[PDB]
Design a protein around this ligand. Sequence first.
Ligand SMILES: [Gd+3]
Ligand SMILES: [Gd+3]
Ligand SMILES: [Gd+3]
Ligand SMILES: [Gd+3]
Length: 353
Amino acid sequence: NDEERIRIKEQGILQQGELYKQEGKAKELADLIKVTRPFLSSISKAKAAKLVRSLVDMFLDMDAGTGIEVQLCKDCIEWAKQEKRTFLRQSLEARLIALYFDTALYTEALALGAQLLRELKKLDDKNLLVEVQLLESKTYHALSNLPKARAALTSARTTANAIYCPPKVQGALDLQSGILHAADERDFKTAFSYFYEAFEGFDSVDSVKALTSLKYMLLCKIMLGQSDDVNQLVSGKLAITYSGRDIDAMKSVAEASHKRSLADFQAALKEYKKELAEDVIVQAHLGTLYDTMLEQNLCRIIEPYSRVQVAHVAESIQLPMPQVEKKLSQMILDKKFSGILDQGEGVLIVFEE
Ligand SMILES: [Gd+3]
Ligand SMILES: [Gd+3]
Ligand SMILES: [Gd+3]
Ligand SMILES: [Gd+3]
């Protein structure tokens, strides 16, 4: 009866907290957290955290107002400390770091991260340490500090060597390595391998992450100029399943690339504004991707000529000529093209490769 009426109670609380979340009543849920506190002392420290963690998770998926969200976390952490529930305090603090990150509150996502690690490093069961090291790698990268983001991730993967992780943890580790080889625009080749490991690892487990990895595999393939490969990849038995607007964007960019068409690439950037320009990681490579498209299109226009009017190239790509001259002279300077320019009577000469 008493091993029983407490179990029905745990259900009760979660279920009502669940109901508050659905009809979006943040105030009452903040109250539910405050009110359940006495109760928590009648169950194991371990079952306790489970409950408290579960509820704050409910609060943070509510659009409750960042400040109110952050408050509620500092409140529960405060309470956890003034109650000596260390494991839970720590795991609450980890959830707060996550919140700061998703909020763009990055200097504090570092400050708390800095604290919690000192603690976590001096202990066993490094599962949480991983969470936090990867979270650091994420936040350092969000702040543009590549070395210290690479540095944090190397730790994480080293920690994850002794343990055997859940696929979703593994997955995130491969997504990060993926992101970070790509970030300096320097190793799209191995960046791709991580994204493929990530994809292989997220597939049938977490399929938003799964889609994201695939998408990024495609990005890299494009970025390598290997956008022919893109079809065969999507084609394969497992990828098809993942059809959507994200995949259509990549296929559509891949296509502009194969066709060497800037006009198509402009078209695809604006039809797929959401899937591309608004994707933090894609958006990172759009700048230099834009260059390749311009160059490729220029090469395509130039290709039949051994000597061509700059005005002709300019009408053909539809850009002001002052600009178009400037670009071609840069390609010549940078050994990106084998020709020379008659600034005088407006002509570009092309040499036998
Ligand atoms: Gd494998
Ligand atoms: Gd190939
Ligand atoms: Gd539209
Ligand atoms: Gd004359």
